[PDB]
Amino acid sequence: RVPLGNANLIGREELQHARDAVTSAQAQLDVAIQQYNANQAMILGTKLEDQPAVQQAATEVRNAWLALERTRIISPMTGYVSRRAVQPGAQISPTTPL
């Protein structure tokens, strides 16, 4: 519609309304781009396995696994057994000598 105005054919309000429409469309596209840029701050890390949320749960998995692996009590030193105050069925805490 621009070239007609240069030749004085169509009303000026029609051109005004065209320019306003273009500017409004540009503003809306800016809004969309910004909506995209947010929610891209959460997905900064390239790999799914490296995301902050997943690693938190991995730490808890590790703690639970160490808890389970420690149900078997290992000797820290080579030597000989002297006193034995542990029997099958005893209730044990980390403060009871064995």
Binding site: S24, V31, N63
Partner: protein, 49 residues
């Protein structure tokens, strides 16, 4: 202790990301202001004619 340390670091990263998101939302709202301003300018131009 190392496990706890890693957990804390992950929490810090998440907080940083959320703050960045808010800062971007600010720009989004600025764009909305711009569109509303364009609408007002048009409605004002029509009346003066």
């Amino acid at each position: 202790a190392r496990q706890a340390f890693e957990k804390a670091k992950t929490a810090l990263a998440s907080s940083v990301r959320q703050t960045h998101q808010l800062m971007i939302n600010s720009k989004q709202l600025q764009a909305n202001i711009e569109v509303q301003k364009i609408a007002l300018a048009k409605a004002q131009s029509d009346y003066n004619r």
